[PDB]
Design a protein around this ligand. Structure first.
Ligand SMILES: Cn1cc(-c2ccc(-c3nc4c(CO)cccc4c(=O)[nH]3)cc2)cn1
Ligand SMILES: [Zn+2]
Length: 209
């Protein structure tokens, strides 16, 4: 339950890399920016490493189970995640019982390779009502947050179109929605312990001008 957030220095290459994955994976979205807001760059305020003994225990236990079940290859990937429930994720860990039901691959926990895709879910599905303060889906004042996660993919099952499932197919540990049709790739897990909220990114979207 006890989380420790260690601040990474802007001069540390651990921090520089995380910002590089965030900034370099920004892509033009089909909604014209309705959910995330109009922007071309981020203003990264703080990058923190999330430390929780039990969450790391749950994840490492599962990683071992997935590894054994997939020829000793857990197939981990660092993907982004945006959710209005960041606080509960860093303290209580991801919970499949809070799976995005409305998803194209059903009730799973969704991650993106593109940071801009996760930014549309920072304030809820389709950006919700936006920032709690100024009710703006495009707010440039409020500090937003998202996670850059360690995700245990195991044997991924590739899909190209909407296929609703509750759990990953037999013999598989995850679903990947590939851009064929799809705008950007989306990664889906059906178990909370197959993701660890490694990095906590406090940032702002930048008003172009
Ligand atoms: C119960 N509840 C679940 C939610 C919530 C929270 C987060 C997401 C979510 N979805 C993503 C999708 C889905 O297309 C693709 C790619 C990335 C993401 C992502 O970072 N977060 C979805 C839903 C709200 N309330
Ligand atoms: Zn605001």
């Amino acid at each position: 339950a006890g989380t420790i957030l260690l601040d990474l220095a802007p001069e540390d290459k651990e921090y520089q890399s995380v910002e590089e994955e965030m900034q370099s994976t920004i892509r033009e979205h089909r909604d014209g920016g309705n959910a995330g807001g109009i922007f071309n760059r981020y203003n990264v305020i703080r990058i923190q490493k999330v430390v929780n003994k039990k969450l790391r225990e749950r994840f490492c236990h599962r990683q071992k189970e997935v590894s054994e079940e997939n020829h000793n290859h857990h197939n981990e990937r660092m993907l982004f995640h945006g959710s209005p429930f960041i606080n509960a994720i860093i303290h209580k860990g991801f919970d499949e019982r809070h799976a995005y039901i409305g998803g194209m691959f059903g009730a799973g926990i969704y991650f993106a390779e593109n940071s801009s895709k996760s930014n549309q879910y920072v304030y809820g599905i389709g950006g919700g009502t936006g920032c709690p303060t100024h009710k703006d889906r495009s707010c440039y004042i409020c500090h937003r947050q998202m996670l850059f996660c360690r995700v245990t993919l195991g044997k991924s099952f590739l899909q190209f179109s909407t296929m609703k499932m509750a759990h990953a197919p037999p013999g598989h540990h995850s679903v990947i929605g590939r851009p064929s049709a799809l705008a950007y790739a989306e990664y889906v897990i059906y178990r909370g312990e197959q993701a660890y909220p490694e990095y906590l990114i406090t940032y702002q979207i930048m008003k172009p001008e």
